[PDB]
């Protein structure tokens, strides 16, 4: 069994036995699966914009597309923006849980930071883009394109999005980048939309903005 290359979480999660799929174990509960199904009948357009396809569960297996699969040299960003179990945001609207590289900038997932902090750690997550100025920051207007169109149908959905995160990708020659969002184990029904987490996904537009605009 081939273990995949996580960048955060604590869940079982390998490779499938085939191309471009991997299976991550439903440790606690089916929850994860009911939630897919909720959102497959009831926000069908929001599951095929932002969200890894679910092929389909075998016992307690979901077997989901592979975000990094048609990447040479994938960098991966793990952000939470849906709500913590109890502990508070580490960047206060949201909390990166990882990103490709980050041992060698001593990032660590505990630390409250400051906004300085928060964005020295994305800049670190830029660094494998290369110094072509004008090439990263086509990545980071693709993701504000994306999480923009997100914020706006999250006013429209009615789940409360308890642990989810951003998966942000981009090959290293910066030819090809995404973000889609992730893990549902938690997601909850309620009677309004989630404003904490359209507020991390504003928070996230704001910063990259600042970075494609800044220009140092
Ligand atoms: O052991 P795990 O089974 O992966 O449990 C993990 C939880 O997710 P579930 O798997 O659904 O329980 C996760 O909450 P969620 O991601 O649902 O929001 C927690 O984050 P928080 O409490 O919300 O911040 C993680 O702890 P910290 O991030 O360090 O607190 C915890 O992992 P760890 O305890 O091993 O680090
Ligand atoms: N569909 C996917 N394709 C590629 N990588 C993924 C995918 N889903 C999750 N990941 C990777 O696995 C990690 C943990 O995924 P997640 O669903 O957040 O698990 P957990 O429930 O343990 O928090 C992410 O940080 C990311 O590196
Ligand atoms: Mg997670």
Redesign the pocket.
Known sequence: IRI????????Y?IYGQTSGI?C?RM?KSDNEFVIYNYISEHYDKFLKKYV?KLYGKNNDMLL?????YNYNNPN?M?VKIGARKRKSHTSGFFSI??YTNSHDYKFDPDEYLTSESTINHIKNFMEAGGENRDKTKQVLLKWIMKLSELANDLFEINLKFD?V?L?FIYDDDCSKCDV?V??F?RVKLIDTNDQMTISAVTNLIKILSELADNPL
């Open positions: 995949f290359p996580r960048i955060a979480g604590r869940s999660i991997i991550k440790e890894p989901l597309e592979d975000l990094t991966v793990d849980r990882g642990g995160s998966i889609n992730v893990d184990s």
